[PDB]
Amino acid sequence: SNAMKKATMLTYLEEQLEKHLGDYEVGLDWDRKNHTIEVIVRLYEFEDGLLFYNPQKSVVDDEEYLVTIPYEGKKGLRKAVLDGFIHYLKVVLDEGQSDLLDFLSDETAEVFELHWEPADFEAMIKKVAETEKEQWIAYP
Amino acid sequence: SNAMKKATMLTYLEEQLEKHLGDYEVGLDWDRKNHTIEVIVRLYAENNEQVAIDDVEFIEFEDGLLFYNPQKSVVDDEEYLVTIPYEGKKGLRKAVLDGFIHYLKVVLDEGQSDLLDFLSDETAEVFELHWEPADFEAMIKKVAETEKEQWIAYPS
Numbered sequence: 480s481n482a483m484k485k486a487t488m489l490t491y492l493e494e495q496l497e498k499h500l501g502d503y504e505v506g507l508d509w510d511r512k513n514h515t516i517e518v519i520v521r522l523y524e525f526e527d528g529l530l531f532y533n534p535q536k537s538v539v540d541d542e543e544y545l546v547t548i549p550y551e552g553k554k555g556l557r558k559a560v561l562d563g564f565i566h567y568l569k570v571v572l573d574e575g576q577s578d579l580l581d582f583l584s585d586e587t588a589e590v591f592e593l594h595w596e597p598a599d600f601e602a603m604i605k606k607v608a609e610t611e612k613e614q615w616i617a618y619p
Numbered sequence: 620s621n622a623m624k625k626a627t628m629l630t631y632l633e634e635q636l637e638k639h640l641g642d643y644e645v646g647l648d649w650d651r652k653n654h655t656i657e658v659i660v661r662l663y664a665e666n667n668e669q670v671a672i673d674d675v676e677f678i679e680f681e682d683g684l685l686f687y688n689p690q691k692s693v694v695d696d697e698e699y700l701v702t703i704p705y706e707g708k709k710g711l712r713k714a715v716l717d718g719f720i721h722y723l724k725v726v727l728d729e730g731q732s733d734l735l736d737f738l739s740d741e742t743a744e745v746f747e748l749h750w751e752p753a754d755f756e757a758m759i760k761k762v763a764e765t766e767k768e769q770w771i772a773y774p775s
């Protein structure tokens with residue numbers, strides 16, 4: 480009934496993360512002091528983060544995360560990218576699980592990590608940016 | 620034959636560095652793989668009171684300022700003094716490259732001052748270099764009113 484929001488990358492991610500990936504312990508951390516938004520994710524235990532930063536104010540060590548992604552401060556990011564993200568993400572998680580199991584039984588396996596290919600991800604941004612015109616989700 | 624080329628960040632920096640900061644110990648590292656250009660910087664000072672510092676007669680302080688492609692480079696912001704993003708091939712507006720040069724000089728001037736003060740002011744706890752974005756921005760603004768926008772691309 481009474482549902483009305485301000486459309487930020489935050490709320491948008493929220494919604495899209497429950498409407499496309501509600502099966503997972505995918506969480507969100509907003510470090511507003513360091514203008515960053517982490518997508519804490521847990522697979523069942525394995526935990527990695529994905530980061531959104533403003534290169535003009537955020538401090539970051541790319542290595543602590545699977546991906547780092549810059550947004551344009553105030554403007555935020557393109558919907559056609561936040562989409563390509565939440566989709567390519569499922570790709571990486573679903574593909575992540577089928578290989579996470581192959582780590583518990585395949586004694587031939589050595590280390591388990593997640594694979595985020597930028598190339599395939601860029602392709603995802605195209606895949607989605609082919610349905611709607613420019614839309615920009617702002618940052619809080 | 621001979622060709623003529625519009626400046627790129629690497630050449631432009633190298634050029635400006637020698638032109639405006641010859642008196643200082645400044646180097647460049649082009650990490651081609653990581654799509655990154657680092658400006659290395661060294662201050663020296665004579666140690667008299669044989670003041671006891673951590674880790675290590677003539678002290679040396681080194682630091683670095685990094686240019687990176689946010690779409691390409693992998694970077695630990697915390698390894699450098701500043702971490703300046705550029706726009707893939709587009710590069711950076713000249714005014715930014717220029718504001719950088721002129722602010723960097725300020726930073727090293729004040730740096731060398733603070734260093735000498737470090738070794739003689741028994742009250743000084745720590746010495747480092749200070750990069751105030753607001754002062755950087757102001758430098759850029761100050762140049763951006765001198766001349767007309769012009770971009771300086773990234774090497775190929």
Ligand SMILES: [Zn+2]
Nearest residue numbers: 539541694696
């Ligand atoms: Zn960074």
